[PDB]
Each structure stands twice: as C-alpha cells, then as structure tokens.
Subunit: 350 residues, 6 copies
C-alpha cells in the first residue's frame, strides 16, 4: 500500500484531501506536519494511526513516507516541494505548483534525476460538469470542436475591494483550475488573449478575467470568471461542427463538503437531473438529435487514485509536465503587459 | 410630405425599405433609379405611382446599390440639394466618412448611415432595461448573431464583404449608440473553416475603463444558440433569447402592414433577475418592444422636416467605421486604443 | 337592418347564437318559436324586442322575418327546413340534412324561391382553426403533407344508447372539423373511414377516424374519441418546410358555460401556454422555432357573414359545394361496415 | 372636475399617489401642505398648477378644495382626518385609518353627518394578482370557494429585531392590505384565528403572522406573512368545489415605482405571462380544463377614479364603512390575547 | 384481515425470511382497537389514558407494544428528514405537511371521531413530524367537515408550535383540484419544496408488488427542490433525489427489538403525544388552542 | 456454450458489437467471397475466422435462407426465427411494461411512430413499410396478437410513382382496441414515440431508444451509460385509480438491450407468419385499401 504524509493541516487539507482519503484502503496517511498542533482539529485523526509533528525533518527523514502532499500558503510551495524531492519522496502540490515558470521546470527536472513523481494537485479535473464535457469531446460525435467557453462566476459585489499581488487574484486562484483541464484535453495553445482586471476597484487585485486560448485557426476555448453575474451562464458551452453541448450547473462536491456532507454518504457528488447537459447534433443522415447526457460522477478522490496507480504501478502521470509548465506560463504572462493583451506561445522543448 | 428616391432596387430595397414605406403616408417615393430595370419585381410599385429610370434633379435619396459605389454615389447626391440615407457600408474608409459628413454639413443636407437594427425588438428590450437602470452599473454585455451554416463562407475576398462588416456593423452600432466611444478594442476576426477565406467569425470586445465591456460575436457553427443578449449589472441581469422576427416574416412573404408583424413570442421575452434596494430578488419577464424597421424613416422624417436631431450621430458613424477598419490594421487577435 | 326568427330556444340558441347577436345591432330578433315557453329565459329577451310564440305558423307566416335559424333537435331539421323554405332564408344548425339528396333538394329548392340556404358552421371561427388557417395561407411550412384534427373528450360511459346516424359523434362533431378543413383544401379525391363505439357495440358512433386523401401528397385526418386522458394536440400540421403543433381548443365554449358573455373583455381569448408552436426552415436552410399568437375567435362572425350575403349580396360563407361535399362524406360513412373506403 | 389637496409630501405621496394623478384629467391637485418643501421634489409639480405651503390653514380654508388626502405620519391620522372633516371636505386617509376601532366609527359618523365622504386609502385593492382572484371568484366557475390563502413574504432574516408598538409590526403594516381586499370580497367573518410573533427575536415586534378568517363552516381565508421564505409560496391559492386557481408572482407596480418607472411608461401594470395564474376546474359535464388567466391590469390610480366617481357622481363608495371597521377590529384583537388565539366576531350595526 | 392486511403488510413480508406469518383471525376496525407484544394499527388508541394503560400493561408481561407508523418510511418524508438532518437550511422556522385529494361529496355521513380524517390521516403526518421535532409546546386546531355542517370531519388544519421560532402545520382537504407541495420546508438559510407523494400506495393499488423492480420508485419530475445560501452567501438551487421508500422497513425495526432488542422504532413518548394531540383537537368546538404540558411516564 | 456463424458481414452495427460480451457464444466464419480486410480488420484481430467457402460455413451450430436451413444448422433471418431486435428498445419496453400491469385498464388505442425529416431522401421489399414498418408492427403483434382486419395507406408523399416512404396502418383488434403504425419522412416536429390510451388513462412517450444513435456515434454496448434514456423523455402516464383520484407520474424507461435477443422460442411462429402476411396483403389492392384476416 501507499504510505503518505502531509505538510499543512488547513482548510484545503481538511476538505479536498483527507475526507476522500478515509475511503481509500490502499492509501496510508502516516504523519501530518503542522506549525502548531490544534488538539481539537487533530484528535479526530489521531484516533487513527495518524501522527502530527511540529518538526518537518521528522517526516522528511522518515523512510516510510513515499509521497507527501503540500497544502500550505503559496509563498512556501517552491521551497517545500524542493525539500521533499530532496529526500526520496514524491510530491503533490496545491496551487500554485510554483511561483515562476522557471522554478516549475526546475522542480520537474529535479524529480526526474531523483526518480520520484512531482505533480501539481488538479482535483477539479474530476468535476462532474468537466467530466461530462470531457466524455462528449472524447466521443467526438459533436464533430470538430471550434469553441468551448468555461465559466466560474459568482454574484458577490463588494467581495474583492483591496489591492494585492497577482498571486492572490481570481485568474491565479480560479483560472488555474479551468485553464488546467482545458489544456489537459486540447494541449498547449499557440496564442493567448488576456482580459484581466477588477470591475469594481481600479487597482485592486483582479476579480475578473476573460482569457482566450487559440488553437490553430478553428478552435478557441474561453476562460471566464466574473464576481457579478446575477443569472448564471452555462457552466460549459461547447460548439462543434456537428452540434453543441450546453451544461448548466456546477459540481456540488464543494457545497456538500461545506455543508458537513462527506464523500462516503450516498449520492455524494451526484448531479441533479435537471442539470444534465443537453446535446443537439445532427448525425450523418442529417438527422437532428437532442438528448441529455447523464452527468459523470464527480469524485475528487479520483486524483488520489491516479497518484496511487502512478507511483506503485508506474502508470502514466495524471498531470503531464508539459501541461503543468504551460499552466504557469499562461498564468504568468497575463501580467506581462497592461490588459487587454496578446501573447504567443513557442513550442515546449523539455 | 417627404419625397425620396432610391439609388438601387436590389434584394434590400425590396425587403427593408419599400415594404415599410407603404404605410408612411407622409412619405412619397417619386422615383427609383436602377441600371437594368426588372418590371416583374417593379410592377406592383409602378402601379402605385413610382417611376423608374436609369439616369439622374428635382429632397433625399436612399443608396442601396452594390456596396462599392456607396461613397461615389454618396458624395454625388450631396453635391445635389438632396439629403442622404446610405446603407452599410456607409463609407469604405474613416476619412471618406468624415468627408461626406463635412460636405453634408456645409451643403445644407442631412447625411447618416442606415442603422435599421437600432429598431430590432431584442435590442429595444435591452435598451429599455438599460435606460430604466434598475440593473445598476452595467459591467458586461454580449450581443450575438449566429447561424449554423457549416460550409457557407468558403472563399477569399476583401474585408468589405465578410461577417464582421456585414452582420458585425449592426451589433457594434446599436451598442455604441448606447455607451459611446470605447477606450480600446479587442479583435479576434477569422474564418473557422477556410484558413484564408473572408472572415466568417469574429469576437470583438469594446472596453470602457475598468467597469464596462461589451462583446460582439458571430459564428456560423452554432447548433444551440446563445441568448441574443446577455446583460450583467451590479444589481442584476437580463438575458434575452430569440432574434427579432421582422426579417424572417419578410422572407415568408409577410409584410409590415399585416397583424402580429414584428411581435415577439412570449416564450422569448427576456428575463430580468435583480435585487432592489431592500435586497429582495426579483425575477420577471420583460415584454419585448415591437420591432419596426419603418421607424428609421419616421425618425428621419422628424429630422429633415421637423429639424429634430438625427438618429445616428456623427461621433457614432465615424467611431463605427474606425473600430470596423482597425480590426485589420494587424493580424488578429490584436488590440487597438481609441482616442477622442 | 336584417330581421330574423329562431325555431328552438334550447341550449344552442341560448349559447352560440343569442349572446353573440347582443352586440350585433343591424340584426333584429323579432320572434322565437318553441314547443313550451320557459318565461325565466324568455323575460330577459322579452324585455327587449322579441316575441315568444308557441304556434309555428306565427313565425313562418310573418312578412318581415327574412331569415330564421333552426336550432331544434336533428330529428326534425329536414322537414322544418322546408317550411321556412316554402316562404321568405334559412340557417340550419348542425346537422344540415341526413342524406346528400335531401341536402341537394333543400339547397336547390331554395334557389327556386329566392332565399339563401346555408348551414351553421360557427366553428369555422375557432381560434385554433384560424391559426392553422393563418399558417397555411402564408405557407411558410411549404406544401402541407398532412394535417391532424382532434375533438376529444374523456367521458367513459358517456354514449351507451343506439340512435340514428344523425345523433352520432361523426355527424355532431365530425361535421365541424371536416367542414373547415374542406373549406381550406376543397373537395377530396377519396375518403377513408372507421366509425364505431369503442364501448358499446350496438350504441351510436362515439368514436371516429376519418381520412381525406387529397391526391398523393396531402392527407388531412379527423379524429374524435371519448376516451382520451392525455390530449393529442388540437391541431397537427406537417409541411415540406416545417411543422405547426397547436394544443388547446378555442375557449368561447368554456367561457360561455362559465357565464362569460361575448361582449365581455377577454372573451374567447386563448392563453400563451397554448399558443401554436411553429418550426420550419427558410430558404437559407436555417431552423426557426417560434410561437404563433392565437387569433381571437368570434362565433358571431358567422351571422356577420350571413348578414352580407343577405343584404349586400356578398358571397355566401358556406359554399353549396362544401355543404354538399360535407354531407356526402358524412353519409357514405355508413354505406358499408367499418372500416371502409369511398371515392368522390 | 374634482379639486383636491394633500396634507404631506413624503415618500408615499410621491410614489402611490401623485405619479398616478398626473393622468386623470378630471382631477386637479391645487395645494400640497408640508412642514418643509423640498424645491427639488416639488419643482416638477410646481411646473404644473400645484401650490406648496407650510401653513395648514392655507389648505383647510381653501373653499375650492373638495377632498384632501392625508399621507403624513400615522400617529397624526385621527387628528387631521377630523380637522379636515370639520371643514366641508371629504377625506382619503393612508394607513392606518385610525388607531382605535372607536375612533374609526367616530370619523365615519362625523363624516355622514358633515355630509362628506370618508374612506381609508386601500390601493392594494388594485394589485394585479388580487384582481385576478377577484375576477375568477365572481365569474364563479370554481364553484363554492372553500379555501383561499394569501401571501406577502420576503427573505430578510435579521431585518426585524427591535421591540416596538403593535402599529409598527407586519400585521399592521402588511396585514391591513391582504385582509382588507379579502374582506371587501367575502365580508365580515364569524371568527378569526391568530398566529402572531417574531420568529427571530422573542420580544421583538411581529415580523410574522398567520391569520385565519372563518366564514361559516365551509370557507376559510388565510392571511400569511413570513420574513424568512427563500422559495416563494404562491401569491394566491384558491380552492373551490369545482377546482382551483393558483397564482404566482406579485404585482410589480411597487418594484417599478421603486425603480423609477412611472405609471405612464410602457408595460407598467402588466403582468409577466409566465406568472398568469393557472385555473384547473371541471365543467358541469365533468370535463377538466386547465388554462392560464391573463392577469388584469394593476393600477393604483383606479382608487382616485373611484373616489372621483363617488364624490362627483354620487356613486357608491369603494371602502365600505363595515369593511373599514372590521379591518381595525381584527387587527386590534390580534393583540387582545396572547398568540395563538381565537376571537369571535359579532355582527356590526353602525 | 382485509384492506390494510392485504395492502400495507403481507406483500412486504412475502420477501422477509426472518419473519413468518401464520394464523390471522392486528388491523381491527378503528372502533374496536383498545381491547385487543402487540402491533396496533392506526389509530393506536382512542383516549390518552387508554393509550398509556394499554402500553403500561405491556411493560408488565414483559412484551413490546408499539403502534404501526409505516409512513415514517414514505419517500417524501425521508427526503425532508435527510435535508433537516444535514441542516444546510439552517434553523427550521416552518414546515407544512399536506395530504389532500379531490373527492367532493365523498364524506357526507356522521360517525365517531376516531374514524375521521384527523384520526385516520392526521396521525400519519403528525407522527413523523413528532418523531423529528418532538412534543410541541402548544397546538392549534381547525377541524371540520367543509361539505356537511355536522358530518364526521373530512378536513383539518393543525399547527404544532415549537417555541417562538418553529411551527409546523398538518393539513388535509378532500377538495383540492390543484395540489400543494407534499412538504414545504422553510429555514433561516433556505427552503426545500417537495411535490409528489410516495408511490408505494399507487403501485400497491396497481397490483405491482414490493418484490419487483421500480416499486416505490419516485420520478425526477418530483424530486424535491432545495434553494439556500452557503456561508459565502451564494444562492444554490438543486434537486435532491428522493430516498427509496419501503413500508416493510417497519418490521425490520420491530423485529429488531423482539429478537435483538434494538431501540423501539416508535418511542413511547411519541405515540402517547400523538393520541394526546388527536383527542384534544376535540376537547372544544373548533377552532381552538390546546397548551401541551411536559410528559412523564 | 454454443457456436455460431454469420451468413454475411457488414451487421457490424446491430449484431457483433452486442455478441462480444456473451461468453457462452462465439462467432466462426462470415460467408463472404470478397471479405475486404479494409473493413473486417477489427473482427479479424479477434479470434474469429474470415472465410469465403460455402460449405466451410455450411458444415461444422447456428431464399439464401433455404440453404442455411437445409443443413442441420439453425438460422435467424432479418430452431428458426427472424431477427426482431427492436423488441428490446426502451420505448417499446416501456409501453409494454405499462400494459402488463395495465393500470390504464383496457387499452383502446395506441400509435407507434418512427419518423424523420429527410425531404428528398428517396419493389415492396425496398419499401419503407417493409423495412421500417415490420419493426413497429412486429412488437405490437407480439403483445396483443393477431388482428381481425387491417387498414392500409401506403404511398410516397415525395414523387407520385416511387417506392413507399410513408404509411398509416391500423390493426383493428375487434371493436374496442385499435393500434396504428405510422411512418413519415417529412416531420419537422416529431409526434410522441408511442401514444397509449385506455379506459382509465394514457401514457405518452417521447424520444426513441438511443442504442442506434450510440452505435452510429462510436459508442459500443459494453460501455457505461450505453442505451440509457434521458429523464427528459421518460414516459408520462395520466390515469385514475379505483378511488377516482387522478395520478400523473413519469415512468423510468427500461434499459434497451438489443443483445437480449441472442440470449433467447421468443419469436412465436404465428406472430412470424402473421407479420409477413400483412406486409404482403398491404400491396394487393391499390391504396388506400383494406384487408380482412382469417
């Protein structure tokens, strides 16, 4: 079985990680590192083989831990991921994988010679809505896709009202997710279009973005996040030469988790029928078709399943290096020049 | 009683002009000019008092001939004591446009572009909403005009005959006559089917500072339509599905005079979802205003006979051709700043 | 101002005729004949200009009564038609005659007298029909390949007795849907039947499936079933450029029963929920799914027609060609056991 | 032509009164009294023949004024209503008509003897949703009405928290509208049931009520107001022996008005067709019928049309004296005993 | 033996192994139920006193005595149970439970209160709300026959008050052409509205037996709808699949107390509170108000 | 476990794909004297044998049929039974389940549809009524039985003298029940897939079984979600119980497994002979016509 450890015990760890791990028989969470142990938030876990320590080395030196998940503040990712790759352990890093496009390459390179797996945490590649469009595009019955719009909107006027560094903005904390899974399906684009700003406060950190990733001359996928959307856009708009696929309703795992409903419970991550995506396409006979597509089951744990299969079964790494590095690049160059801006992408020669 | 003429008589004059004029009792069409007359399609009209010739001289004409001679025929009729109502393209270049404008102002005549789509039902609905302002500070608008005609546009040709110039000029216009002159523009013009053919797709966004941004876009490969209009404010939204039906009813052989003409289907009434001062959410349907292209002339009437200000403003028409042209000044996607 | 009389003062008269003639000034109802007079219903009218008599002759032997409407039961339509015919115009209520002969007779035997003789086809003014009619004329659906017309109910145990074919659904309801469709596509080339009583073998027809083949293309259908829980559309229309489906019947009948009179604002008005849905393609190949606002229906518009035909001699609404055609199909429907076929 | 005046120029006068009067040609608003005239909010009316004064007698002594409308603070209504009746002028009073059922009987009686019309301003008798039920009930196709539920809810958790006098709670502020129009339709009920309280803060003034009006043994009409309703109830529910009428959505005049859309604009008072009430009933033959019922046009101005018709043409008054007294009484006795209570009504003999 | 026995029992046991019937001469008419471990059907008993006694005497011989409240396993009710337990709707401030029909002129006769709508229907909707929120501090009654002035009650509107914040109503009308939601739930963070009753009965009456596929199955069309705001203040509206319903589950818990000894499905304090509320809805001419006192046994 | 063979190839859509999950069965040879590997490639890769020799596949367990039949080998056309796979469609299975428990009472009418909107897409065998019609006709005859009489309306709404691409066929089962089979290549707004009326209620079903659409799409049977109907199309049923109450609810559409045929005799002989009778006697007299049955 796989023996893992954690560095950090905050919100994300307690919501998007551990909860799904209580079901994986093959994964063994041995030790969790924490700056300071919170008896109330640690007890529940200590009642299990889990050990909390305040000494980082006491985990980095443990020849038992095989991989460790870093989920602490962004200002500490590069350093930590490097220290863990230094020991003979694999890493799993929460957004952002790294600060600069250079550091990311380095880390990935270091992991190779050390013969360990370095991989960013892209759980939202297991969202039902995404999984649904993934499936469709995979079956290719919609023909050749020419446009795909992806939204992550809210109605929170007044939410973001202060200035801050680019890493604490929408594009960085939310775009990474949408952009990531689109890149994992269609590849690295040739050119990118940027619209990033704060529609409510001049210089405040970005709380709005509209990013276009151009693939050739036909295909383009848009990444849109707005915090002032009263009536939601479709979660995913997909147009192909043969038809379309519209999917309303986002994955509910995040809401269930926020409402004490955990993964083991029945129907968890199950989408509402009213929100099943609608497909409208004409077949070879020119016959128009309009049907619903049962939304795939959204399970964030599936990320931990691929990491288990990638480490102990040499299976192919879920998040390829090319995507991981491409993500940082697009994300980093959005702030290279005032918005709106354009930026071409040269091939990746790793 | 206004007296006008028609420099042309193509598919256009026989669908967006004449059919609406047989109701404007205050307007009289004395003569239609055409190189090669077609009695078959000109018989009904002739039998009502309109004469046709192939030459010239008598207070306003409408250019609807091929979109090339417009400028040439434009400054030609201004040179005569006659007001001008030009069809799109109003002018090839921005200088030529500002030219005709200057000439008109001194020649003592009225000159403006034919923006019939400013009276489209769908547009009139989001115009009404924006005026009343219960949606607060508008932050985004998206105007669509799509089709699903895969295989349609598949040949090279000048920018003057692509979607961005054909369809595009309409959506861009009504959006500008509502917000003004953008401080910068985003261009993504191309052909999603034939790498070099004239553009059959575009995604143009007009930026207005940090707050406002309106997007205009056409695509010919949309099987399930987007809403004709998406409007987001700081207090709520307004989504409108379904396009104005005037055009379609015209092709069906249905004319302006008939009943129900230009009436929207209830099922397509746009939905506004916003919250009042108290914070209560309200979600209601907005009755679509009646679409009527004939209003272009009615309004033009009050301008040439009652002096009332024209529908299309100068700042408008010019700013309209500028955005339209600079979308080629570079390969797309490109950005372009607009100065006063 | 045309002057008329009525032979009968039952439900029909007091529902599809009188209330509508209340706003029609040019028409005057001088006298009404009935076997037995019920003052309760007479008074409101008597308070106006109207004489209620119990002697048939009182009416027929009048000089200013130019036209009379026969609303008395069907088992007396034929003979009575003659009475008014053998004197000064006749408007007979469904069903005109029982045989194409009597129908042919009364029809012509009326021109040798100098009076108009047309049947009562009020449902040729139903909004749902005015809708398909408005669609067909504009013809954007192209060449109509088929049309389905329903008039169903859900009344098990409804009709159990046997009776002449004049008192059957086909005659009572069929004449309505068949009429307006014939008034639209003319006389057919051949007709298919299927008449019976899906509940009581002997009982009079309470169900009927009739097809009117118009050549090789068009084929209008007419159906009525007293055992339908979930309604069929009120009107199905398929063409070469698209379709038009209309749910919900005209509401004048429901409003009349609930006491809402013709003159009331909103009378007969159809609800959006039931507006017909049209889906077709244009010359560009684009698809279009839009709603067709149901046109307002007015059963009075019939008396407005019979008015012109009598005063300004305007073209008679129900062509003698349609009247005779309708009865022909209606009659031959029992020539041989069902199902059957019959050409014209 | 009817010549009237106003005592007060606050929010309600500039919202539910004047905007509608600027279209009834037969009515002339001559003078408006107010302690302080806001030249801005007064200019437009001044552009017309309306005089603004801070001297009450300047209005009461004006012999040209036939009727006045008191829309000034509630605590002053009984006083002013009287001071105006003592002068030969009819009175239109905003809510509350009076503070006590005893005072109400007084003003009405002083009115009959003084020869002038005296009636409370019940604009809500012209909300579109209410007109629809009034239309259906009169047409009588639903048969005998057995039950009818009337709602006025919101989702404002926390909105009401401080304790204050009853005249300030929901039952007195909203209940006077829903109870008034139901009573104007069915009459004085035999017994009333009361559920009045604050479902958030015990002692706080009432922000909730569920009042039952019983008519004999067959009919009961419920008046309901709750400030914690996320998913709306139907605005009206009507059940009768032959079927029912359910109506969703509330009349939009107030929202429009609040938004700045005036009574003369387009579509004002017209209901969204998606909200037309739905009627399901069986006819005498047993057939079932389900249809929408186009919502009548909502127009608070009709109150003035009715006032006019009565004061100038002697037409029967809108708000009957018995309806006025019954409103105050049912409202007053809701506090006569602790909630949940029951109260028995006796016939009136004004 | 008869209606209930052949309807809401046997068919469910014909799939149970640990259980095995045999004999049958506990579904005696509502008139005669007191006299007769016991599994009494609804209503359990007539008066409050008779109820306690009928239960205490059972705690003497050392056997288990519990009323048959099978609708605690209706899909619709389970849905609101699951939602309330999860608590995303915050503090419940009101819930309305409906059981209506459109059967005009159905009831026009007179009879004992025990065989009235409130007793033979109120008990089903009252019990489950009681087994989730407990005994109420005060009850409100509106019980009558809206068709015949003196016939047995065929209508009722009863409100159970839980303090100052919570109230839940139980309503039954036989004259409702257009249905209310089956359950309406309002709370400080949102609502849950549920249209469409448990289908077991419809299938039972349609000959479809419990031991077959699709039984009790609810359709999406009727999946309750939840609308509420999360902590971020975001509005969420979603359908909530309806928990499969099975009346058989009643025995699984009864049997679970006889041979195993698990906690009795229907707690004593509940069953006693039930018959108490029923009986007092009559201790006075409607409408009336009955304050509940604390229980002690 | 039995062995089988295919007297043809191509079948590569409504046959093989399904069989490759039925362990106790295995193909052998595909009688084809022109088996172009360009297509039979996939299958070739599988443990199957592509031959072209007559007796090779005519000697070894299960017109052109006469031959296959003459030998001791059982055959299935399209133990001897014809291939009626569409008896396992979601729609039909639904309209079938409802009748089995028949809470609708006594069925009195039902319309089976299969339409398209292919304007210009155009002997009796080549006939739409023959090829398509037998599909909608077989299952109905499989549920009720043999009708007394039958009504025909065969023709081509396209070009006067061309193969039949439309038809309205009624099957009068006495004086009460009447099932109608309809097909039209000109329908922009589809009818329901099935209409079923009865003494106590109705059941209307929209949307056809998706197996075919999945197949021509690239979705093989063994995959998940294959053949699942969208809730959007679950059938609706309005019916009154014995108490008089009206009940309206959806009916989950049963999973459509064409492969269920092989698992099976299913197709009765009479149903089979009767099936072909009506097909034939429908072209006798010109249309519109009628034809009684013995």
């Amino acid at each position: 079985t796989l023996t893992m450890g954690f560095i950090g015990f905050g919100k994300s760890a307690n919501r998007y990680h551990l909860p799904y791990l209580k079901t994986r028989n093959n994964i063994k969470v041995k030790t969790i590192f924490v700056r300071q142990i919170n008896e109330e938030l640690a007890a529940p876990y200590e009642e299990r083989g889990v050990y909390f320590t305040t000494d980082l080395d006491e985990l980095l030196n443990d020849k038992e831990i095989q991989v460790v998940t870093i989920c602490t503040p962004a200002h500490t990712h590069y350093e930590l991921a490097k220290k863990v790759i230094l020991a003979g352990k694999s890493v799993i890093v929460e957004k952002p994988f790294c600060d600069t496009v250079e550091h990311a390459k380095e880390l990935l390179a270091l992991g190779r010679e050390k013969g360990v797996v370095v991989m960013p945490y892209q759980n939202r590649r297991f969202d039902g809505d995404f999984l649904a469009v993934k499936q469709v595009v995979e079956q290719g019955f919609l023909g050749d896709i020419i446009e795909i719009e992806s939204h992550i909107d809210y109605f929170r006027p007044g939410s973001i009202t202060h200035e801050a560094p680019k890493e604490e903005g929408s594009f960085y904390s939310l775009g990474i997710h949408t952009m990531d899974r689109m890149i994992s399906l269609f590849g690295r684009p040739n050119t990118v279009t940027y619209d990033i700003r704060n529609n409510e406060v001049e210089g405040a950190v970005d709380n709005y973005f509209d990013v276009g990733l151009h693939y050739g001359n036909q295909l383009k996928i848009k990444l849109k996040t707005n915090h002032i959307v009263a009536k939601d856009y479709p979660r995913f708009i997909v147009h192909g030469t043969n038809g379309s696929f519209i999917k309303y309703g986002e994955d509910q795992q995040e809401n269930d988790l926020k409402a004490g409903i955990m993964p083991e419970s029945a129907g968890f991550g199950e989408d509402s029928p009213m929100y099943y995506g609608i497909a409208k396409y004409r077949n070879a006979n020119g016959d128009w078709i309009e049907k619903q597509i049962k939304t795939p089951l959204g399970d964030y744990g599936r990320f931990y399943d691929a990491a288990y299969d990638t480490i102990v079964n040499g299976a192919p790494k879920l998040v390829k290096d090319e995507e991981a590095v491409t993500n940082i690049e697009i994300l980093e160059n959005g702030f290279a020049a005032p918005s709106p801006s354009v930026y071409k992408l040269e091939a990746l020669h790793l």
